[PDB]
């Protein structure tokens, strides 16, 4: 009984425990993750031969562990807003190519937007033109990142409201986490709690400021949610579709009006703290909101994450 070489482990590697090469029954080799910024997920590592000649963990299983990036750090821990300092959003994408746009990283492979960012991209076959771990819009310094893939929601209806406003990129590649380079995390079930109305989120990006114009450099906005009848309300005028805020929505800016997210940061993860884990997670998109950023009364309107994240889960464990 000889289990053989064992298969590599991406995000991490593998160790001979009994010898170097050693493959035979009772054998044990321990696989590792570079437990800075991954961690192992499935087991501890350890694979010992077995006698059906194949690798196997303490639990059972023949197959592989996963090195899984560490999510959600941030250094703190766009109208009106401030200039973020490097590793503040370390998960911040800029999407180029037909227009400006945002996402935010997932594991280090996947891209979260809103599907309206990328859906004339998607549909005529170019692939994206993905950049990060830059605060500066134009820098020519970058993690380049290219799509393999592009998700749209299949409930999503281009220039037809902004109900599943929400789309998922594959990238060709890994990007390496580090300091500079972060995924955000998803919202755990409960997280919930964490975006209640008056609850405090931070939109980042390189959109139009108060200016009027693209922001250089990655700006961000702490805001507060909104109620959704008033959100609701608020949009129930013309010249906005019947119905153009949804129950997979969430408003989220100022009575007054002076700080919101605008054309350009589309696509960009409003992120809350989950104060327990003490990790920052993605509780909405940037989707909508009035043609004129900052007005008074005209709330941000932001895909809500937490309702899409068994199709988040269905693309990922799928692609
Ligand atoms: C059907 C009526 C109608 C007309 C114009 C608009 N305007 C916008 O949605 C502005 N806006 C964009 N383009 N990205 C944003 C990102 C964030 C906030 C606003 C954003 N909505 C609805």
């Not at 997920?41 to 194949?54: I, L, R, S, W």
Request: charged residues 20%.
């Amino acid at each position: 009984v000889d289990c053989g070489p064992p298969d590599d482990l991406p995000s991490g590697r593998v160790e001979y425990i009994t010898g170097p090469g050693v493959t035979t029954y009772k054998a044990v080799i321990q696989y590792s993750c570079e437990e800075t910024f991954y961690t192992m997920k499935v087991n501890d590592g350890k694979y010992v031969c077995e006698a059906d000649g194949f690798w196997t963990s303490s639990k059972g299983e023949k197959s592989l562990p996963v090195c899984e990036p560490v999510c959600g750090l941030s250094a703190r821990t766009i109208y009106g807003g401030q200039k973020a300092k490097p590793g503040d959003f370390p998960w911040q994408v800029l999407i180029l190519g037909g227009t400006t746009a945002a996402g935010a990283l997932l594991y280090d492979n996947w891209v979260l937007t809103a599907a309206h960012a990328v859906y004339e991209q998607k549909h005529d076959a170019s692939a994206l033109d993905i950049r990060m771990g830059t605060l500066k819009r134009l820098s020519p310094h970058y993690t380049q990142a290219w799509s393999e893939a592009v998700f749209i929601h299949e409930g999503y209806t281009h220039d037809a409201g902004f109900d599943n406003d929400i789309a998922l990129i594959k990238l060709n590649n890994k990007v390496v986490i580090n300091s500079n380079i972060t995924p955000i995390c998803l919202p755990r079930k409960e997280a919930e709690s964490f975006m209640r109305t008056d609850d405090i989120g931070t939109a980042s990006g390189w959109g139009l400021t108060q200016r009027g114009f693209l922001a250089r450099n990655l700006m961000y906005v702490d805001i507060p949610i909104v109620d959704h009848q008033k959100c609701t309300a608020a949009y129930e005028k013309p010249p906005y579709p019947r119905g153009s805020v949804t129950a997979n929505m969430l408003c989220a800016g100022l009575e007054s009006g002076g700080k919101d997210s605008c054309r350009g940061d589309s696509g960009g993860a409003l992120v809350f703290l989950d104060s327990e884990t003490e990790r920052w997670f993605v509780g909405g998109i940037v989707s909508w909101g009035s043609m004129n950023c900052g007005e008074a009364g005209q709330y941000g309107v932001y895909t809500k994450v937490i309702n899409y994240i068994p199709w988040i889960e269905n693309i990922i464990s799928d692609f």
